[PDB]
Structures are given as C-alpha cells and as structure tokens.
Structure 1
Amino acid sequence: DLKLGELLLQKGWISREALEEALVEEEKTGDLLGRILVRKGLPEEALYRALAEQKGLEFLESTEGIVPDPSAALLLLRSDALRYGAVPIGFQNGEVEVVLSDPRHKEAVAQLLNRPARFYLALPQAWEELFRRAYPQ
C-alpha cells in the first residue's frame, strides 16, 4: 500500500519537489498532508481521487443523480450519519451502499454497520448535498 504522496506522484498530479516541500512543512506544522498539498495548488478532486483509490473506495464524481433510499437511511441515526460522515443511500446484491465524506472513517463506519457494505467517497459539497437530501432536519 502506497502513502498518499507516493500515490499522487505515481498519478502525475504532484511533482517530487511539491511533495518534498509539503512533507517538510508537515514535519514543521503537523497539518494533514492532503490539506497542505491542496493549499499549495493540488486540485481537491485530485486529492479525493487518490484518497479514494488508497482506501479502496469508489470516487463519486457527482451525488446529484442519487435518490437516497429511505430504507437504507434508517440503518444510521442522522446524528451518526453526520458525525461519521456516512450516508447510506441504497442496497445492491445484499450490500448497503454508503457514501463517505472522509476515507479515514471507512473502518469506523464499516464496524458500526456490521454488514456487507459498498463504500463511495464524495467531495465535501457533494457529500453535504446528499446528506441533507437523505436526512432532512
């Protein structure tokens, strides 16, 4: 398994000098690497695509075509969907389909769901739009 920086290098979306500059700053700041890379010019979608591939998630280019299944939304309390950044949207072959806001949460969510699941990753704005449609307040 590759680290995020190596992944982006392999995909040609950052240079080695950009990575080394980010990693030297990270050693001096503690900030998340992806956050530093984006601040320095990496497209945020480049970040999420690499983060998706790293955690074995399907990157969702859009959430606009998704009609959330109310049955699937019941599998998580709204407050949990929010804090875990997970939207269950439907079912496929006996697995629940779940759209995450942060790939670092995949394991915490998968353990909670305790059932076969298919995980997707969406950009922040797209995720929030999907969450509000799935969990009206």
Structure 2
Amino acid sequence: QKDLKLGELLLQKGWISREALEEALVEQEKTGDLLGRILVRKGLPEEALYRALAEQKGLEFLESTEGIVPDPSAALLLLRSDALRYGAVPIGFQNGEVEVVLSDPRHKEAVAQLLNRPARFYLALPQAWEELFRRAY
C-alpha cells in the first residue's frame, strides 16, 4: 500500500483532475481495482500516467513487448487476467528480485500476486502491457 499516492502525484503534475483521482480511487479502495490504471480512460493520458507513477513509486519506464519479452517461468506468477487486474507482469530473477512491469503499483485486491518474489518495479503504456498480459498466459 505505498507510493507518493497513486492518483495524487498525477494530480500534482497536471495529469489528472481531482475528480478522476477520486473516481479511480473509490474503485481502488471499494472494488480493489486501481487508481492509476483507472485514471487513464477517466481523463488521464497514458504517458502522463506513467510519468507520475514512475515518480510515485520509483519505477523504470519501458517499451513495447517486442523489447519487453516475458519470462517462460516467472510469467505464470500472475496470469493474463490477473495481470490485467493488477496492472503488472513478473519477469526475471536477480539477487532474489523479479521485475514488475507495472501499469499501476497499488493493486489493492491482490498486489501480492506476482510478488511471490521480492521485486524491482518497472512501468509502461498499456499497449505494451496488454500484449504482454496475453503473452504471459
């Protein structure tokens, strides 16, 4: 449950409206869905989403999946539909950590999925992750 507030930094950066923050936040807190993830589509542009998320969480922004190729084994720590809900895909293993290609770091319902490993967190536009979710499982 930690970042420099999902939604809030996006608001501070001029990426979202407060109202978008709150709609997206309510579903995050209420349904377990996600504020960053929901904010895009509710008024937030995507690179802008990711730019704040990168600063909110400490994420390394990524490219499409012709670059970001999933891990034959780690990818199954979060399946396509879990990855979609989560806003993430698990890739790799180094010094105990799995990389997480986020769309949104707060997954209230089950951020624990994927994080069956210690992890490093990454970030990018949903086009990339959408294909990656399908590639993952």
- Identify the TM-score tier after normalising by the shorter chain: 0.5 to 0.7
Instruction: Quickly say closer, same or farther: Cα 1:37–1:96, change in 2 above 3 A.
Output: closer
Instruction: Quickly say closer, same or farther: Cα 1:107–1:93, change in 2 above 3 A.
Output: farther
Q: Cα RMSD between the aligned structures?
A: 5.1
Q: Which runs of 5+ in 2 are unaligned?
A: none
Whichever structure has more helix as a proportion of its residues is: 1
Q: Which runs of 5+ in 1 are unaligned?
A: none
CA distance in 2, matches of 1:109, 1:47: 19
Give the number of aligned pairs: 135
CA distance in 2, matches of 1:69, 1:28: 32
Alignment deviations for residues 86-106 of structure 1 (CA, whole Å, 9 cap, x no partner): 211222222111212223328
Alignment deviations for residues 18-55 of structure 1 (CA, whole Å, 9 cap, x no partner): 99999999999999997999789975312311122112
Identity of aligned residues (%): 99
CA distance in 1, matches of 2:84, 2:18: 36
Q: 1:97 — aligned with what? A: 99
Q: Is structure 2 residue 28 aligned with structure 1 residue 47?
A: no
Q: Which stretch has the larger CA shift, 9-18 or 114-123?
A: 9-18
TM-score norm. by structure 2 comes to 0.60
Q: Which stretch has the larger CA shift, 88-97 or 72-81?
A: 72-81
Instruction: Quickly say closer, same or farther: Cα 1:93–1:51, change in 2 above 3 A.
Output: same
Structure 1 residue runs of 4+, over 6 Å off?
Answer: 8-42
Larger Cα-atom Rg:
1
Q: Which stretch has the larger CA shift, 100-109 or 80-89?
A: 100-109
Instruction: Quickly say closer, same or farther: Cα 1:116–1:10, change in 2 above 3 A.
Output: same
Conserved in 2, the CA contact under 8 Å of 1:63 and 1:122?
no
Q: Which stretch has the larger CA shift, 120-129 or 32-41?
A: 32-41
How far residue 2 of structure 1 moved from its aligned partner, in angstroms, is 5.5
TM-score norm. by structure 1 comes to 0.60
Instruction: Quickly say closer, same or farther: Cα 1:44–1:83, change in 2 above 3 A.
Output: closer
Instruction: Quickly say closer, same or farther: Cα 1:85–1:4, change in 2 above 3 A.
Output: closer
Q: Which stretch has the larger CA shift, 51-60 or 1-10?
A: 1-10
Query: 5 Å matches for 1:86-125?
Result: 86-105=88-107, 108-110=110-112, 113-125=115-127
